[PDB]
Design a protein around this ligand. Sequence first.
Ligand SMILES: C[N+](C)(C)CCCCCCCCCC[N+](C)(C)C
Ligand SMILES: C[N+](C)(C)CCCCCCCCCC[N+](C)(C)C
Ligand SMILES: *[C@@H]1O[C@H](CO)[C@@H](O)[C@H](O)[C@H]1NC(C)=O
Ligand SMILES: *[C@@H]1O[C@H](CO)[C@@H](O)[C@H](O)[C@H]1NC(C)=O
Ligand SMILES: *[C@H]1O[C@H](CO)[C@@H](O)[C@H](O)[C@H]1NC(C)=O
Ligand SMILES: *[C@H]1O[C@H](CO)[C@@H](O)[C@H](O)[C@H]1NC(C)=O
Lengths: 532, 532
Amino acid sequence: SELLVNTKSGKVMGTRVPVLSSHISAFLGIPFAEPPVGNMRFRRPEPKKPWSGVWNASTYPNNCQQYVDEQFPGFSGSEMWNPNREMSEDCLYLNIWVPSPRPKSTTVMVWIYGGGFYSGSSTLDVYNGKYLAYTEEVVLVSLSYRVGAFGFLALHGSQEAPGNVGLLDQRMALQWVHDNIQFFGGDPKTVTIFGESAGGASVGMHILSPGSRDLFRRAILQSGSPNCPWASVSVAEGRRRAVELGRNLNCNLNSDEELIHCLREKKPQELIDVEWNVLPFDSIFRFSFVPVIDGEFFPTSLESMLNSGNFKKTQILLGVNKDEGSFFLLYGAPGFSKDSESKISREDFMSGVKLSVPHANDLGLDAVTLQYTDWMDDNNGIKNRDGLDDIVGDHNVICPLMHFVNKYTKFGNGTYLYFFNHRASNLVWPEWMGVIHGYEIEFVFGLPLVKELNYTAEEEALSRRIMHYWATFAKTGNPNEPHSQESKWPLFTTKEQKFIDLNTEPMKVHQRLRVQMCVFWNQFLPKLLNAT
Amino acid sequence: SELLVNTKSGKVMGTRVPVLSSHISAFLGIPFAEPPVGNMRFRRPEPKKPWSGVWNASTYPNNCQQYVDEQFPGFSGSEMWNPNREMSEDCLYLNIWVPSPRPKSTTVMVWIYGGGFYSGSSTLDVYNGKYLAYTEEVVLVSLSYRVGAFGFLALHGSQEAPGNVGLLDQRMALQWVHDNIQFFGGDPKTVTIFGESAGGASVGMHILSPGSRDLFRRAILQSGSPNCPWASVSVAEGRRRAVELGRNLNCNLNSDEELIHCLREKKPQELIDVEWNVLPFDSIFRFSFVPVIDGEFFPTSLESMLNSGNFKKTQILLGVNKDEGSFFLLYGAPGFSKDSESKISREDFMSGVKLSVPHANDLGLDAVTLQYTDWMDDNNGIKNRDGLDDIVGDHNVICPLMHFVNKYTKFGNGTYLYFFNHRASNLVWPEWMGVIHGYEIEFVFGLPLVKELNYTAEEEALSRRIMHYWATFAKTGNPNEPHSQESKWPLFTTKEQKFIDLNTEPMKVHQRLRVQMCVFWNQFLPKLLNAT
Ligand SMILES: C[N+](C)(C)CCCCCCCCCC[N+](C)(C)C
Ligand SMILES: C[N+](C)(C)CCCCCCCCCC[N+](C)(C)C
Ligand SMILES: *[C@@H]1O[C@H](CO)[C@@H](O)[C@H](O)[C@H]1NC(C)=O
Ligand SMILES: *[C@@H]1O[C@H](CO)[C@@H](O)[C@H](O)[C@H]1NC(C)=O
Ligand SMILES: *[C@H]1O[C@H](CO)[C@@H](O)[C@H](O)[C@H]1NC(C)=O
Ligand SMILES: *[C@H]1O[C@H](CO)[C@@H](O)[C@H](O)[C@H]1NC(C)=O
């Protein structure tokens, strides 16, 4: 049977699913870890105990326990990112889409979802891998990992809650793929991991971490970077936050064992209820429980690893969207609302800056303001709004990624950089939000090939073009077809710094992605803050 | 006799001079002070002792002792600014051009030359007031003042060399005009003082100084401002420089009397030979002996006087040229030469910045570099050259003037601001220098009406238009004709900040003269340097 596959963990039974007037095989909800429940909450993941008989893999698994965005109840723009299955701590499962007939040894792509390390699901409509698997003839895997305190509570020194367990969940899924994907027709030595936002930072993190490097061949990072300022905290700061979480839940605080024991007695929703109360500052684009620079998973500071070339040397493909910031301003910054065009006064602009750069002393805030203010017309609400949008996107996504790109490319074996700047015609969010954080994913996963979802023909053409770049890159380390002629995506070098736009217009080539502003964020501002 | 005028100081005899196929009267070399020679070197000026008989005022006087630019021997571009008469310490004279027939009580304009407070002459071809006097029916006076150590050696506490004596020379000329100009047909209560660069700063300084305010009605400042960073030093710094001058000349240094006595025995050229050796830094646009913030001439810091409105409240007209910096880069900055287009490498750009902002710590230099560098194309020698040009012009001229303008306008009775951006067609300096420091003066003085000097018809039209603005403003406090219609020069307000271009093209109106960069120089950079 094509739907029956025998793995090292045991037999699994998939389901035949339809896709674009054809069919392929899907193996959903396959366990790769012991349910991290009870005394195992906050601990490292254990490998799943092998099972006898047949594991039913015909339906999606539960999603990991997490904060649920109810800011816009009944609004598909926001609700499409929420869990679409029951939440449970028993959530460590993966999903596999396999072409029909089953291939022998083909390219594997493993998706790692984002969601600020506080949310995310493998099971979203928009992450359904069937279109990519069918169209590009790849084995598409999506994994899950613990989020929030469950995945990232960090009390360094303890073995009961060491930190980074969410990242170890990802590694365990990758280990399981490396060990078993061959039985699904996948080629375990041609695995490309890829993810968006926190997923893209995670990808970067496995590139850095010695314990993960051998479990994949190459990587794609979308709108996310391991060095992002939101994506990791110090041991001291992880500790402070964990202790503060216990303080919110009336826990005994005079030792780790006491603290952790108390946190384990709590129901999951109690932890989620107070999760946001531990942030050190009034801020946007900052999440409570994130990876920790622990000296184990990351042997040293991210920056020194990058300078010394202490990382996996392979091919990467990465990029960003035009308007990464707009989501976080709508949710947090004063003046912004979903149903107005959110023209921002000078007052709200100043408030926005402070929220965007929470560490900054006054001089730093002045430096940012000066850099993003048109003083010929500083009461223009459109320019204030768009300028804040740029501040948030540059500081948190684009400029960290450009620093990663520039550092990686010195030691790596091939970089390809993109700038995605097409706003989907059927987007339900307002116009001011522009090309929004997260809305290249639907193009990457082929949703525009589905007519019912009401994309334009030009958007179908762009989605196919992107899927082919991603998959071809996964296969070969190069997004370009060996023989073809519709503009080659040129290699990114230190010297020339070429990248491409990804939109419906005929593809042009550019250089030095937001270099002016990123020199500000990567060179000047940190030196200003260091000297004051 | 029309050429014989009886003054409070005594009778003077002028000469009939030709101008544009007509004639007017000229009274050249009229003394207004005792020759400040011998024991009077460095002292305050004394009023000229009245004389009997007739003083011959038919030829220009001697020029004050000064450094002579021999950087381009035989080059008219530079030599037109050099002394054209014998140099002598006996140099305190003024010149008056009077319409024919002599008027009864008409508008007076008093010219104060520039030259970094280290050079200048009342007698240059380009400062000949006959064209302005004839064309606009004004009495045109040009005064002289001591420069260099002679005019500005400052040992605060001593009465033998208190500082600011060059400025007191200017005041004494103004006193003499206030007392005597009526006998030349001038109206002493409608006197407009005007000057360029150091002359324009001087104008500003008499506006500030209580002892000068009553001696004129209104003011015009061209490319110069009292608050310019080059135009004044502290008491401590004046003292240091004076002592260092004596150290260069082998003087006894253990007291002021000893020091001053020694400096007085020296021939004038000995002082000039070492004058440049006392600058505290490697720098451009900085001059050794300048006005001092002494608590007498300026009762407090310039900035506090400006904030508190401690200044003469009248009408002013002021402005700047597009490329104020280019002179000082040619003379001092590496990479720049007169006979090449002076494309500047990244190395020379960094060297240039440091010379332009000599106080700055490393972070300040970084801030300036970032502000004036196109990082999409940072090896472009044209942009590096032009960017340095802008740095020097903004820091030293435009942005100080805009700070003066904004402060003055809160308490004043009328401001009119111009941006002069026409490059004269017959300029002998290279193209890269643009619209050069000092080259609006020839338009202000009407030289383009002389056909032999080879200006275009369009340049004659511009010169007449400028002379009429200047003179009309001098008469009324408004450059605009009560009834006319060829675009009114609008008033500068705090709110709207309107100014006009001065060029051959049809006059358009703008706002917020270089606000982006001047916010950098006036608000941000000083706050950065203060906090580091
Ligand atoms: C402290 N609380 C409870 C108030 C606010 C937490 C919820 C705000 C989410 C912040 C991230 C903004 C982006 C959200 N998106 C992309 C997920 C919809
Ligand atoms: C230290 N020394 C003897 C070497 C150099 C002093 C002479 C350089 C003059 C500096 C001002 C530049 C502008 C000169 N202009 C406008 C007057 C021609
Ligand atoms: C990648 O590695 C191969 C083989 O080791 C080498 O020949 C090639 O130059 C490399 N390519 C890039 C773009 O670094
Ligand atoms: C100048 O002063 C006059 C009379 O004192 C006053 O009426 C007028 O408003 C003032 N004009 C400006 C432009 O300040
Ligand atoms: C799982 O597969 C079984 C066959 O063993 C099937 O009957 C069932 O419908 C599937 N699970 C469901 C519906 O939850
Ligand atoms: C000054 O005027 C006298 C008349 O007293 C005249 O002879 C002489 O030419 C003038 N001065 C000169 C030429 O230096």
